[PDB]
């Protein structure tokens, strides 16, 4: 769960 | 012909109101008063004169009128106010047709005309009038019973208890509507086909309270059917609530089933008498009705000897077991  | 004078026009139309018969309503007098409505507008002496013309002959007027609450004229007992204004005030300028249902005022008007009675505009007015309840007792027509099935099944479904937002005032009107049903089923001596269809869908959905006495009298006037059809729809869902609720419910089941044993045995006592049609012997039909009611009493007798073990010999249940075997 990373936000780009 | 005194309506050509405009100053006498409320004074003429009150004399036209009190002197009108069926033959006095004429279609050219419809035509002139619609022309006076178009010229000088809405006046209360002209609208009240056309209100009597719709009260006498509605077919001659193509212009519909409102039905609002108006006094229409001088009325409401003001004869002393008329005499005080009489000094100086407003003095300076074989028939094969049908009979209408609204002309039945009392009991002997239906006794003279029963062979010509028309159909109303709704089936909700059958429960309102007791004179229309005499018409259901002697007419065995098919579409007059199917349209009464199509109305009252929609009445019990939309306006029930658990489909609402828990209003106590609408539940009082639902209690007052069920008092009309239990007097109509007893006056007819057969239950309605809407009412046993509602209890097929409400006995899984009922818990044991919330107008218990109007629901246990609704099961009391159900007509006779086979024993194998009643027991998955009624007697399984009755016995889930019979052994588990209070003893005032346990006494009210056996008061309902002793009235169910009244109206089922009342129909079977005279079904032998009114049938000379079948040339076959009726001992298979009475023998098929023998095991339908002997398994009825042995089921409630199985309900009686099991609920005695639940409360462990109370006499208050034991008075109403022996009242069931009085029947």
């Amino acid at each position: 769960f990373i936000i780009d | 012909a005194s309506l050509q004078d405009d100053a006498l026009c409320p004074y003429v139309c009150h004399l036209l109101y009190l002197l009108t018969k069926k033959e006095n309503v004429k279609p050219f007098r419809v035509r002139k008063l619609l022309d006076l409505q178009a010229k000088m507008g809405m006046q209360p002496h002209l609208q009240a004169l056309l209100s009597l013309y719709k009260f006498f002959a509605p077919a001659l007027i193509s212009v519909s009128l409102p039905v609002r609450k108006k006094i229409y004229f001088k009325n409401s007992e003001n004869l002393w106010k008329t005499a005080l204004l009489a000094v100086k005030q407003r003095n300076r300028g074989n028939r094969s047709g049908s009979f209408p249902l609204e002309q039945l005022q009392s009991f002997p008007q239906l006794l003279q005309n029963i062979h010509c009675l028309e159909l109303p505009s709704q089936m909700g007015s059958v429960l309102n009038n007791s004179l229309l309840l005499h018409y259901i007792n002697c007419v065995r027509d098919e579409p007059v019973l199917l349209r009464f099935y199509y109305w009252l099944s929609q009445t019990l479904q939309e306006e029930c208890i658990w489909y609402k937002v828990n209003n106590y005032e609408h539940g009082k009107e639902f209690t007052n509507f069920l008092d009309t049903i239990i007097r109509a089923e007893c006056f007819l001596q057969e239950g309605f086909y809407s009412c046993e269809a509602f209890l097929y869908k409400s006995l899984p959905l009922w818990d044991g309270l919330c107008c218990r006495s109007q629901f246990l009298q609704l099961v009391s006037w159900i007509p006779f059917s086979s024993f194998s059809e009643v027991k998955p729809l009624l007697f399984d869902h009755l016995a889930q609530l019979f052994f588990t609720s209070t003893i005032y419910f346990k006494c009210s089941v056996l008061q309902s089933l002793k009235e169910l044993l009244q109206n089922w045995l009342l129909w079977l006592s005279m079904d032998i008498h009114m049938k000379p049609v079948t040339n076959s012997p009726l001992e298979t039909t009475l023998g098929g009705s023998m095991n339908s009611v002997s398994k009825l009493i042995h089921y409630v007798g199985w309900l009686s000897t099991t609920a005695m073990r639940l409360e462990s010999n109370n006499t208050f249940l034991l008075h109403f077991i022996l009242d069931f075997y009085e029947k």
């Binding site: - | 505009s121 098919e142 349209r147 199509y150 109305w151 929609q154 059809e229």
Partner: protein, 306 residues
């Protein structure tokens, strides 16, 4: 009357829906079906109602019934000039079963004070409603389903007139949240080779004092590749195919947000075929699959009567 008795015992028992259903066929528009009439029926907002079957309805007494309806709805506005006029238009060729009665159209078209603007549209129909046809007589005309377009105050003053003439009663229609999942699975069972919309779902949380809505969008090419991995027996849509399709959509939501949407309540399904709502609001956006949705609405409209 004896077939009226046998239709009660299916409703009195708990079973009323078959677990294995048929995929709906491609309804081709015939030459008897009017192309210029069915374009007016599309892209409209509709409110559903169920109705008991009518009495003394004839196909040649519509000229008298048009003059009685135009004399009454002007008078109901006067109790509370109007250049309005109703049109009783009959449609042909919509039926698939020959024992169904003829459907028709009720409009209110305003006159030309300078085609008029249509203010209200009523539509009586019976599409594949064969289970209620043998429970009525031959004098009765069986049109259970009703669709309305317009204000609710105009619906009640014309719905007063059907109570006092045809001896009937209108009831509000409601579709359960269990039955939205079957018609969402029927809309993902369709065949398409053209321009499509997005599959839209919406759930509501019941365990709140306020409202809580979740908008949820599925691409339909992604929905078709999700469907055929679940759908393994062709020709039939089973009980276990729909309940495993809803479970893998819930498990796709579960690994991201840790919120169980199976406790919630599905209220709006909007796909490329049509859009649905639980209180009777529908928006049909397709003409090839028109009568397949409308036979499913008459499949529910007989069940609220019986």
């Amino acid at each position: 009357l004896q077939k009226r008795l046998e239709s009660v015992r299916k409703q009195s028992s708990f079973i009323l829906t078959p677990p294995r259903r048929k995929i709906p066929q491609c309804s081709q528009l015939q030459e008897d079906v009017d192309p210029q009439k069915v374009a007016f029926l599309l892209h409209k907002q509709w409110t559903l109602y169920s109705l008991t079957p009518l009495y003394k309805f004839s196909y040649s007494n519509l000229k008298e019934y048009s003059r009685l309806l135009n004399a009454f709805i002007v008078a109901e506005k006067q109790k509370g000039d109007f250049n309005i006029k109703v049109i009783f238009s009959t449609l042909l060729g919509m039926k698939g079963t020959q024992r169904d009665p003829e459907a028709f159209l009720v409009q209110i078209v305003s006159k030309s004070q300078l085609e008029g603007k249509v203010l209200w549209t009523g539509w009586f129909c019976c599409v594949f409603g064969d289970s209620l046809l043998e429970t009525v007589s031959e004098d009765f005309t069986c049109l259970p389903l009703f669709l309305a377009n317009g204000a609710e105050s105009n619906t009640a003053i014309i719905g007063t007139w059907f109570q006092k003439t045809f001896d009937c009663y209108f009831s509000p229609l409601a579709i359960n949240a269990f039955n939205l999942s079957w018609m969402a699975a029927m809309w993902t069972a369709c065949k398409m080779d053209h321009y499509v919309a997005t599959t839209e779902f919406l759930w509501s949380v019941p365990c709140s004092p306020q409202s809580l809505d979740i908008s949820f969008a599925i691409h339909p090419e992604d929905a078709k590749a999700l469907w055929d991995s679940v759908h393994k027996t062709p020709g039939e849509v089973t009980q276990e195919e729909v309940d495993l399709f809803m479970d893998c959509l819930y498990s796709h939501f579960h690994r991201h947000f840790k919120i169980h949407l199976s406790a919630t309540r599905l209220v709006r399904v909007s796909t490329s075929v049509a859009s649905a709502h639980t209180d009777g609001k529908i928006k049909i956006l397709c003409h090839k699959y028109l009568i397949g949705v409308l036979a499913y609405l008459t499949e529910l409209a007989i069940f609220q009567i019986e």
